[PDB]
């Protein structure tokens, strides 16, 4: 179980690259697993996996913010973004360079 | 009859760190050359509750890749972005496997 | 002294629990651990196969099968789920209506299919069935008329559909070269190595229809699967389909895990067609289909191995074993266990693809 | 225990005036057979008598008495065969099958035109020993089968109905033609058989009632691995035949093992590879591959010996792995390398064993 | 005396940087008899590639097959210019000479190979990180000219003229002629299906010193994914990666006692970026594996194999399957164990993968 795949992640960690908001919304939002060999698209089957809990997609910070107000605009702590508006999504924070 | 000659001796970059995932162990600091000093501790609160994390100064950090190639991160916060944009928690993650156990009926493990 | 050293080892266990009376039901539990490397170009391949089946109302038949394949290959997750009602219209024809879905990694597509399979032996001679006790080889041919409809919700489906529409009209050799596409891997080799021949498909006209639940590509095509005689899908049409034996639901939870150091196979199953009645009041475990053996022969001859194989036929109290060649090693009052010696030789024979017989005849 | 195959081989050669040879082979292997029907006890007797060598017509009598799954089936053929030309052969004969209780007679008149794809003197001059010679064989066979049994009549009616419909019947008769893995053996041996051409399916009056007339043609392939096209003149030593030649080969196969007994006195065992050298006939490759597909199925240790008795005054000069023992006039191949070659050919190896003997 | 063992040494010296440009040194010896009715069978093959012009993209390849079989010497030399016009269509212009015994014929050829994959789905390439089984079709169109300077050669051309003009089934039997012997089996064991050819032209124009027979013909190779030529067409031709004249010598000698093989040479394309930042030593082409298994199944053998992958400094192997036994801090060594089982696997025709992933 844990030894299969990356041992840190309970669910498959799918980071979201900065594919965004450059051509009719850029529906081909780039989802990349922790393995990183493949580069998938956000098809409804990936959403089925994500709601199944087997995978979990995460937004990074140090990049052009990915449709940050067009995907979802809940900004209570700036990290309340959800895809199907009832997702309970989690954002990865990186104040890498802006902090001392 | 005739054959040709043979010889055969065989026989006889822009690395980032996710502070949400980072736990503040600082092996990146040990893996960084002292002349650069890219890895640095940032303190948030009580040390025993996670407290300080680590950060990279992008301008100072110039494509050494020692941190990630060392593969010393326990938390997987040390990430590498690629020119095409893929992100790597680890250099080589083990493959995901469909796990289900084996029990022979007549063997002693049944 | 001995030759062919440095052999690997395969440890295998099998159990066939038969059911007494007119019920030909069996419970097959098999385990295998092989230390030989697999023949997978994408080696880390683990597949779990859940084949459920349920008796729908037998007024018209239409037993319902439900197959779920989940395969992780090179850390690529694939899942195929098919639920289909299948019914033997007559002894030669079969008609099915079903739905299903594939899902590889990210791309998934659902299909709704109907299918008329007309299976005809190249000959039905009274003399043959009069003279032979059990014809294992039987020449014949299947004709599948398959109408499959797929909503083109994904853009990949749309591009592929446009490509296929252009191809079927631009090239008449498509009907041939589609066979080249039809075998994804070494299946083209296994086709001729298994005795199967596949005729050029005859398209009846694939067309798109505007569906409220997404546009649907509806493709109707017929293809002919001829058999040299080794093919279970043709020669054993009477079998392969528990038309009246499904008085109870049945299941299979098979699976394997294959990686650079080994293969791990676990099969649990309940099958209604394990036992076949024979002449003289004898009943036997069904003759092994030869397509499995031959198709396994391609990969079974890649390493030299020694097999430690056990098999337990839990025979019903009302039956006594007969005509067992190889013979049984351990004799219980009702159970019968084959292991070692000649049976081990047979296991090594069929692991490499040898189509040999393991006649086990049980009777009252 | 362990699968160990013991094979005792011996060949005795006449020389000078004859290319004849007497062969005895006793094989016993513990591996199970690859027959879906387990017990198979078959005996084969082939007797070729020179009816007339001047005419070229030699009479081959072939009886195959087999017991498979407690079913006794006996095939028999008698055929006068003659080379009309070096490319075309003509056969006229009669036979019958005796499968179980069913039995049917057939009278066959056939012509086989074995044409080479290419015949180049450049190829003939260099690379002298021709093995992979490709060619096409056009077989045209007319079969007369008396329709007596009502099941037989039903079969005849079924086939004449199947030829009325089923425009692709010629291609699918190939799938019917080969009961089991023989369709795979087509490709394994390299032969590709084309769609047959049925010149005529008809009935004809006769003393035994109607006789089904079946004239049909087909084409045996041209890879070159198959030896029917590569050695067209070698397989048929009509000129070298002057006495009856007899081969009795029988195998008894139980799940416990296979026991083979072969006793064959035949012409054509010695062929002159070059000037002053006589060679044992080169191994046909189609049997090697067709039996290798079966022999690959089980690991085995090998105990093999080969005894060669030459014509008096001849000695072995060149040899694939040399003879293990040599008595005067007797050579014995055994030990390591010969066992390696035997294990090679059991599993389908087409490697050579070039035994050259000279006066 | 009864033991048959295979002794093999392998050395893969990769070079630093994005370009692989690796050197392969392989020695092999096996006591099993060869699967060749003509023995002894000796062969020397020299393949040297030279960058003719980087701006034009033209590369030049010379292959010299020298062989001795049954005390007969055959030599196929061929110099060719390969040029990638498009990612599907590729052109070739070359000249060569086949000398068998006293006979010798020179040939020239213009040739276009158009390789088209059946499925160009973005879904498959998006999901599968390592595409192995890629179906497709290669259309070859070859115009080959040979001086008819020999009477036997003239006879061959004349007989072929009549053969083409007489039989309409010639396009099927020409495959039997071309696939001489076990080759016709191998194409079925490797997923290769060959369509009937089409003879566009068959004519003769005469040069002042002798006649020239010109034959233009097309054929269609068809790969069911297992074929290296189709599935790895891009990995086939690393012309962009080639700036230095690369070359490989390969000689195998086959007496009935044993087979001895030596393959020494450098060439690009050994390692490709598999994604995820790890360079992968290229996947094994499966056609060699199955075609060699065809003859390797014929006998059993003990395995004594040793592979020595020489990484360039600064790079480490992150994945090996099976694992490396020993490491010299730059050289990773696979000797015995599951690597021996994998060597047995591939010798007998196994298509199992050996994932060598290495990175900075
Ligand atoms: C060295 C010899 C070894 C050995 C070495 C190997 C090697 C080497 C390989 C295997 C492989 C396998 N072996 Mg093994 N194996 C040994 C002995 C065993 C034993 C045992 C001890 O009893 C068992 C239980 C097995 C069992 C298995 C399987 C787990 C596996 C093949 C899966 C298969 O069925 O796919 C079924 C596949 C298909 C049906 C093909 C699908 C593709 C084609 C294009 C489509 C076909 C038609 C389609 C399905 C029709 C659908 C529609 C119809 C309506 C139904 N082997 C011996 C001792 N084994 C192989 C494996 O899978 O590796 C990962 C493999 O590579
Ligand atoms: C595999 C060898 C033959 C073959 C032989 C058969 C046979 C035999 C049958 C069909 C049937 C069907 N075939 Mg088919 N068919 C093949 C190739 C194909 C291909 C293709 C690969 O392109 C397609 C699209 C089809 C299409 C179809 C459908 C029209 C139809 C119903 C499918 C369905 O219910 O599956 C559902 C999917 C499965 C259940 C997946 C698993 C398949 C395996 C083979 C089942 C093994 C059973 C196991 C040993 C015992 C299970 C016990 C459990 C308790 C259930 N065939 C090849 C040529 N085909 C059926 C029919 O006639 O319908 C009218 C039928 O009876
Ligand atoms: C669409 C496919 C076809 C079909 C194709 C075949 C073929 C072909 C064969 C059978 C065989 C059998 N099938 Mg069926 N069969 C169909 C319909 C059915 C139904 C049903 C009412 O739906 C049932 C319950 C059965 C039940 C059975 C048994 C009578 C018999 C196996 C007995 C044995 O001991 O198995 C014990 C077997 C197991 C322990 C192994 C099971 C292995 C795996 C799980 C299934 C086989 C396929 C392949 C290896 C794996 C998946 C590959 C792809 C992902 C599809 N069939 C459908 C319509 N079936 C086999 C038999 O022996 O025929 C005489 C056989 O070869
Ligand atoms: C594991 C390795 C084992 C081994 C494994 C096996 C196995 C396993 C089997 C055999 C089988 C056989 N083996 Mg063995 N065998 C070993 C060692 C040997 C040795 C030896 C070293 O001395 C010998 C001589 C043999 C010899 C034999 C044969 C007696 C037998 C196959 C009969 C045959 O000719 O059918 C030839 C039959 C054909 C030609 C039939 C063709 C059918 C088709 C449909 C008809 C097409 C048309 C027809 C050809 C046309 C002819 C036209 C006329 C020319 C006019 N084995 C090694 C050590 N062997 C088989 C056996 O005995 O079966 C019961 C078998 O399954
Ligand atoms: C085997 C490869 C080829 C083949 C190659 C040849 C060759 C070569 C010859 C024929 C010949 C004949 N072929 Mg044919 N033929 C094949 C398959 C067929 C089939 C079929 C059902 O597939 C048919 C209908 C025929 C029809 C016929 C007949 C018209 C004719 C005489 C047969 C005979 O007397 O057999 C009787 C059968 C027996 C004697 C048993 C034969 C066993 C083996 C194959 C040969 C004997 C040698 C044996 C190894 C050692 C014994 C030595 C003894 C002294 C004989 N062939 C396949 C496709 N055929 C002959 C001819 O040209 O006729 C005009 C001929 O010379
Ligand atoms: C081998 C499997 C396929 C095949 C696949 C390919 C591939 C792959 C290529 C060609 C190409 C060519 N093909 Mg082709 N082709 C085959 C059969 C044929 C036949 C025939 C009747 O047998 C003919 C006439 C041709 C004709 C031709 C030419 C038009 C052209 C250049 C040949 C040349 O320079 O060779 C010179 C001779 C050789 C170099 C001899 C050795 C060949 C082997 C295959 C090389 C392997 C290299 C080794 C693994 C690594 C070497 C490192 C070295 C440093 C280079 N092909 C079969 C069916 N064909 C090329 C092209 O597209 O041209 C436009 C090309 O890329
Ligand atoms: C239907 C099953 C297969 C498939 C089977 C075939 C076959 C078979 C052939 C083509 C052929 C062609 N197909 Mg296609 N094709 C597929 C999906 C695609 C996709 C895609 C989006 O992935 C594309 C871009 C294409 C496009 C094309 C061209 C590459 C090629 C020539 C076009 C022409 O004849 O018209 N197909 C699907 C997945 N395609 C033809 C060609 O010549 O192939 C080389 C051809 O005969
Ligand atoms: C032991 C072998 C491994 C394995 C090893 C490999 C290897 C190695 C390769 C692939 C490749 C592929 N495999 Mg895989 N893969 C396995 C299991 C699966 C399963 C699954 C059971 O869930 C699926 C869906 C797939 C799917 C795929 C694709 C991602 C890809 C081929 C693309 C293509 O052109 O296909 C087209 C395929 C078809 C034309 C064949 C026909 C499809 C099926 C059989 C049709 C019948 C379906 C159904 C049962 C019928 C009834 C319903 C009908 C609607 C009537 N694999 C098993 C476990 N796979 C290749 C790759 O990625 O290529 C880039 C590759 O190199
Ligand atoms: C005319 C031939 C074709 C062609 C056909 C093929 C085929 C087919 C294959 C390769 C393969 C390879 N080729 Mg190439 N290739 C062509 C052009 C080139 C050029 C170039 C710029 O000219 C270069 C540098 C290469 C380089 C390469 C490598 C990237 C790769 C082998 C990797 C390895 O480690 O091999 C290890 C090295 C070897 C084992 C050395 C082999 C040396 C011998 C002398 C050549 C092979 C002989 C073969 C077995 C028999 C041929 C007999 C025929 C009758 C001619 N190719 C030309 C245009 N090449 C393989 C690969 O993986 O492709 C992706 C592959 O499958
Ligand atoms: S990449 Fe180099 S500079 Fe940047 S943190 Fe690592 S060691 Fe320091
Ligand atoms: S190694 Fe990982 S946990 Fe430790 S300081 Fe670096 S990023 Fe944080």
């Amino acid at each position: 179980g844990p030894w299969s795949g990356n041992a840190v992640h309970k669910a498959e960690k799918y980071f979201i690259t900065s594919a965004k908001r450059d051509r009719d919304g850029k529906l081909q939002i780039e989802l990349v697993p922790a393995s990183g060999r493949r580069k998938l698209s956000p098809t409804p089957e990936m959403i089925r996996r994500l709601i199944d809990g087997e995978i979990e997609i995460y937004i990074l910070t140090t990049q052009p913010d990915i449709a940050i107000d067009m995907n979802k605009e809940i900004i209570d702590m700036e990290n309340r973004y959800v895809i199907d508006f009832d997702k309970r999504g989690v954002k990865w924070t990186m104040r890498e360079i802006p902090v001392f | 009859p005739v054959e040709n000659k043979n010889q055969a001796p065989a026989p006889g970059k822009h690395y980032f760190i996710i502070e949400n995932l980072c736990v503040g162990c600082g092996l990146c600091l040990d893996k960084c050359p002292p002349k650069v000093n890219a890895i640095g501790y940032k303190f948030y609160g009580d040390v025993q509750e996670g407290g300080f994390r680590c950060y990279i100064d992008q301008a100072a950090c110039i494509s050494c890749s020692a941190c990630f190639s060392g593969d010393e991160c326990p938390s997987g916060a040390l990430i590498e972005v690629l020119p095409d944009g893929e992100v790597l928690d680890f250099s080589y993650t083990p493959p995901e496997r469909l796990d289900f156990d084996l029990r022979f009926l007549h063997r002693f493990h049944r | 002294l001995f030759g062919s050293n440095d052999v690997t080892t395969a440890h295998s266990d099998y159990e066939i629990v038969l059911e007494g009376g007119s019920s030909s039901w069996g419970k097959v539990k098999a385990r295998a651990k092989v230390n030989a490397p697999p023949a997978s170009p994408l080696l880390p391949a683990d597949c779990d196969v859940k084949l459920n089946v349920k008796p729908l109302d037998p007024a018209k038949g239409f037993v319902r099968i439900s197959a779920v394949f989940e395969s992780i290959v090179d850390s690529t997750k694939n899942k195929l789920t098919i639920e289909a009602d299948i019914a033997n219209e007559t002894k030669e024809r079969r008609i099915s209506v079903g739905e299903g879905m594939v899902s590889v990694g990210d791309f998934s597509h659902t299909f709704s299919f109907e299918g008329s399979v007309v299976n005809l032996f190249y000959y039905r001679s009274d003399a043959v069935r009069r003279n032979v006790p059990n014809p294992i080889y039987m020449q014949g041919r299947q004709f599948h008329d398959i109408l499959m409809k797929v909503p083109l919700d994904n853009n990949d489906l749309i591009d592929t559909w446009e490509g296929t529409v252009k191809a079927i009209g631009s090239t008449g050799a498509f009907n041939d070269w589609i066979r080249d596409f039809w075998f994804i891997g070494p299946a083209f080799t296994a086709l001729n190595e298994g005795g199967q021949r596949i005729s050029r498909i005859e398209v009846n006209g694939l067309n798109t229809e505007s569906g409220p639940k997404g546009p649907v590509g509806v493709s109707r095509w017929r293809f002919s699967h001829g058999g040299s005689g080794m093919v279970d899908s043709i020669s054993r049409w009477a079998e392969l389909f528990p038309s009246d034996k499904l008085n109870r639901p049945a299941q299979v939870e098979a699976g394997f895990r294959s990686d650079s150091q080994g293969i791990e196979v676990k099969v649990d199953g309940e099958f209604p067609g394990v036992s076949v009645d024979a002449g003289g009041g004898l009943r036997r475990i069904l003759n092994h289909p030869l397509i499995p053996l031959v198709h396994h022969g391609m990969v079974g001859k890649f390493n030299n191995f020694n097999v430690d194989a056990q098999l337990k036929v839990v025979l019903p109290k009302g039956y006594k074993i007969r005509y067992a060649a190889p013979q049984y090693r351990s004799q219980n009052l009702e159970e019968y266990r084959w292991s070692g010696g000649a049976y081990a030789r047979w296991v090594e024979h069929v692991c490499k693809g040898g189509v040999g017989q393991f006649e086990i005849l049980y009777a009252q």
Side-chain angles (χ1 to χ4, degrees), chain A, chain B, chain C:
Chain A
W3 290 270
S4 40
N6 210 347
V8 179
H9 319 322
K10 293 285 198 187
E12 309 185 14
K13 191 151 293 178
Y14 273 92
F15 303 104
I16 306 185
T17 325
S18 190
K20 69 165 204 66
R21 193 40 62 177
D22 289 317
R23 176 190 178 184
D24 57 65
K26 199 148 291 290
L27 193 43
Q28 46 266 13
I29 308 165
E30 194 58 70
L31 267 59
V32 169
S35 305
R37 292 179 211 89
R38 62 192 65 86
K39 281 184 87 71
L40 308 177
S41 58
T43 54
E45 199 256 346
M46 285 287 278
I47 313 178
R48 276 153 42 99
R49 299 160 174 264
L50 165 65
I51 205 70
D52 183 276
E54 198 185 352
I55 77 167
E56 271 166 349
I57 72 178
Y58 298 113
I59 290 174
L60 305 164
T61 298
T62 36
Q63 69 192 330
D65 289 354
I66 321 171
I68 205 70
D69 298 324
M70 302 294 172
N71 291 334
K72 205 67 184 152
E73 219 179 352
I74 317 182
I75 41 171
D76 191 28
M77 210 57 203
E78 296 309 308
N79 51 16
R80 306 275 298 190
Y81 311 118
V82 282
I83 288 291
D84 59 349
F85 61 76
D86 276 319
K87 187 179 85 79
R88 191 60 259 161
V90 176
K91 188 256 285 169
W92 286 141
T93 310
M94 286 110 76
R95 43 185 148 199
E96 199 75 39
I97 170 68
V99 79
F100 92 113
Chain B
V2 288
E3 276 175 276
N4 40 55
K5 182 63 161 54
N6 195 237
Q7 167 53 231
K13 315 303 284 290
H14 312 111
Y15 293 77
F16 298 106
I17 275 167
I18 309 174
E19 68 255 11
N20 292 359
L21 276 169
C22 187
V23 299
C25 84
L27 292 166
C28 310
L29 269 154
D30 204 31
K31 289 295 123 171
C32 194
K35 43 162 184 58
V36 181
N37 286 309
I39 313 292
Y41 279 167
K42 172 60 188 54
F43 295 85
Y44 283 116
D46 288 11
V47 64
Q48 287 162 160
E49 315 189 18
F52 65 100
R53 326 288 161 177
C54 65
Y55 78 93
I56 290 115
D57 267 333
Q58 304 297 132
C61 161
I62 172 65
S63 178
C64 313
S65 193
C67 328
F68 187 71
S69 292
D71 275 297
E72 69 269 355
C73 190
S75 51
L78 187 43
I79 58 170
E80 171 181 7
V81 293
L82 273 299
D84 63 341
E86 59 199 22
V87 191
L88 300 167
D89 284 327
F90 201 86
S91 53
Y92 172 73
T93 74
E96 46 187 49
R97 308 299 301 269
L98 200 144
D99 294 336
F100 56 119
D101 203 3
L102 160 70
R103 311 212 61 168
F104 302 93
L105 305 158
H106 311 150
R107 213 166 158 269
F108 63 91
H109 182 255
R110 56 204 206 177
Chain C
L1 279 85
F2 302 92
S4 80
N5 212 353
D6 278 309
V7 294
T8 183
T9 313
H11 292 277
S12 61
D13 194 357
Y14 318 99
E15 186 172 334
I16 316 156
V17 187
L18 296 178
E19 279 196 33
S22 307
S23 295
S24 300
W25 279 74
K27 267 181 294 305
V28 176
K29 324 286 159 187
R31 313 284 180 267
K33 187 178 68 217
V34 190
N35 295 1
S40 272
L42 297 183
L43 207 38
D46 317 325
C47 178
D48 206 353
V49 170
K50 307 298 197 210
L51 289 151
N52 296 112
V53 71
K54 302 169 297 287
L56 203 58
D57 203 90
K60 296 292 177 296
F62 288 91
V63 291
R64 180 187 288 269
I65 201 160
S66 160
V68 175
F69 316 132
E70 191 162 297
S71 71
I72 316 182
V73 180
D74 211 7
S75 78
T76 307
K77 184 93 163 175
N78 324 324
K79 185 191 200 67
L80 163 60
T81 64
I82 294 163
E83 305 183 350
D85 305 322
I86 315 167
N88 264 348
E89 180 186 333
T90 177
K91 312 296 166 49
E92 313 291 325
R93 296 183 51 115
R94 200 166 295 178
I95 179 79
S96 74
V97 173
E99 59 101 21
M101 166 211 74
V102 313
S103 71
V104 166
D106 79 327
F107 162 68
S108 75
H109 90 260
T110 310
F111 47 91
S112 301
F113 62 94
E114 67 188 27
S116 190
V117 179
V118 190
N119 192 359
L120 302 175
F121 301 144
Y122 288 143
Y123 75 108
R124 279 98 56 102
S125 179
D126 185 37
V128 166
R129 61 164 59 108
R130 163 166 81 259
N131 290 304
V132 79
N134 46 353
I136 298 188
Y137 293 137
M138 192 55 155
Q139 293 80 252
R141 193 164 272 269
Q142 276 174 149
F143 318 117
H144 304 227
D145 206 358
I146 318 168
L147 175 67
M148 41 177 67
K149 318 186 275 294
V150 176
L152 309 172
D153 48 352
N154 291 320
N155 294 318
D156 307 317
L157 287 153
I158 306 167
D159 285 352
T160 309
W161 172 261
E162 281 154 342
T164 310
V165 164
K166 288 170 74 172
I168 56 142
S170 303
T171 314
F174 182 88
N175 298 123
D176 205 27
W177 301 338
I178 195 57
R179 306 193 307 198
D180 203 8
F181 181 77
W182 190 53
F183 305 114
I184 179 60
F188 185 64
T189 77
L191 184 79
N192 212 353
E193 277 305 307
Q196 299 178 357
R197 194 156 64 88
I198 290 282
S199 162
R200 312 191 181 192
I201 77 171
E202 182 179 352
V203 291
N204 305 299
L206 52 95
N207 160 64
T208 183
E209 74 185 355
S210 60
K213 227 169 173 184
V216 184
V218 172
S219 48
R220 208 173 296 101
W221 54 292
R222 61 180 73 248
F223 88 93
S224 204
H225 171 212
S228 60
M230 313 194 78
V231 192
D232 47 359
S233 309
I234 291 106
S235 50
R236 311 170 72 85
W237 192 241
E239 312 176 352
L240 270 77
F241 200 65
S243 317
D244 308 333
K245 313 296 291 171
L246 274 193
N247 306 118
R248 289 184 291 113
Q251 58 184 359
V252 162
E253 290 89 0
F256 74 95
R257 171 192 191 94
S258 288
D259 36 26
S260 305
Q261 324 288 294
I263 294 155
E264 216 177 351
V265 195
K266 281 86 77 180
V267 184
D268 292 315
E270 196 156 14
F271 308 88
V274 171
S275 293
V276 172
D277 188 75
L282 296 149
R283 304 189 54 92
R284 56 175 173 84
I285 305 174
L286 83 167
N287 300 321
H288 200 306
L290 310 178
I291 280 294
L293 286 188
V294 172
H295 288 209
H296 198 285
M298 262 74 76
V299 292
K301 307 181 304 196
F302 287 160
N303 297 79
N304 301 326
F305 58 94
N306 281 348
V307 284
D308 202 357
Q310 314 279 118
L311 159 71
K312 183 169 64 150
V313 175
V314 187
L315 213 71
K317 278 85 190 169
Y319 300 97
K320 202 248 176 187
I321 214 76
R322 276 159 186 88
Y323 205 50
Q327 306 282 335
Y328 55 87
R329 186 188 187 178
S330 180
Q331 171 174 2
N332 210 4
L333 271 77
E334 320 302 330
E335 296 179 337
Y336 289 108
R337 191 189 318 276
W338 286 263
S339 165
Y343 177 61
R345 277 193 274 97
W346 191 83
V347 170
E348 197 173 2
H349 183 67
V350 304
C351 277
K352 292 195 178 72
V355 282
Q357 209 172 11
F358 191 27
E359 267 157 348
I360 292 171
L361 275 72
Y362 75 105
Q364 288 277 343

